[PDB]
Design a protein around this ligand. Sequence first.
Ligand SMILES: Cc1nc(Nc2ncc(C(=O)Nc3ccc(Oc4ccccc4)cc3)s2)cc(N2CCN(CCO)CC2)n1
Length: 266
Amino acid sequence: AKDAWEIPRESLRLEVKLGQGCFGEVWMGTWNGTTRVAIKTLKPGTMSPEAFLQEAQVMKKLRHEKLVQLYAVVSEEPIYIVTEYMSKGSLLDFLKGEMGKYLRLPQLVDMAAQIASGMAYVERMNYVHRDLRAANILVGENLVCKVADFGLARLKFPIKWTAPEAALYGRFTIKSDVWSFGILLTELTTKGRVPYPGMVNREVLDQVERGYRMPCPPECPESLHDLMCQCWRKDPEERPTFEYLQAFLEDYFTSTEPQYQPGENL
Ligand SMILES: Cc1nc(Nc2ncc(C(=O)Nc3ccc(Oc4ccccc4)cc3)s2)cc(N2CCN(CCO)CC2)n1
């Protein structure tokens, strides 16, 4: 039985390749010769088609302004995942590009508050992302940020972004996503730097297990680092909700850091 979101591969035109990944490619194209779309292609053998269709039933129920809207799916290998096209691409690309030097703390916190908003909806909908990182956040015009690839990680493991209980025991919850968000905050405040710079995956897992946490990034206020440390609490239940995170980040420059003033890069 054909899924409502299942479409023929023929109805798609793969016009411009936007990037290359480990498991596939990302293209800019057209669907039914009228809609500009983004197409994530997956190499055959990288994902089970049946498992993806079952997981896509949950994603169909998820409708939010800060979530990338899923349009269509091609269930036959190579699997094609069709969404709305986002003007500036990945948040990591945007931070590591020409724009990243002009982004200050107000713009970065605004983007974080938008990601927290998308994730607070995921939280309320009793869902889990599993791969919350800058690379999986899409940017458009007016710093519009949208959470992408929700629940696809389960179907190159990002040790640096994963909570210890999830990386070591497979305990993937909304609280492990909160840990990942704290790591995402580190990517924003350092403007696209890799977490725990200079440390290999084994050193990270060994140090974080011993209680190590990334220090306050240069010229980042202690209050924002304190929030990162709240996301990085050892006990998953002690970590803040995304609902709390969104509110804290939305109100940041009034209720928390009104003494904020621009520095060299923040
Ligand atoms: C990499 C890239 N993507 C662009 N736009 C994009 N819009 C959407 C994209 C995108 O990544 N789409 C996408 C589609 C389906 C996916 O699958 C799932 C989604 C949700 C749940 C489960 C699976 C995953 C991802 S990519 C634009 C772009 N540009 C335009 C801006 N240029 C200059 C810099 O601003 C650089 C090239 N570069």
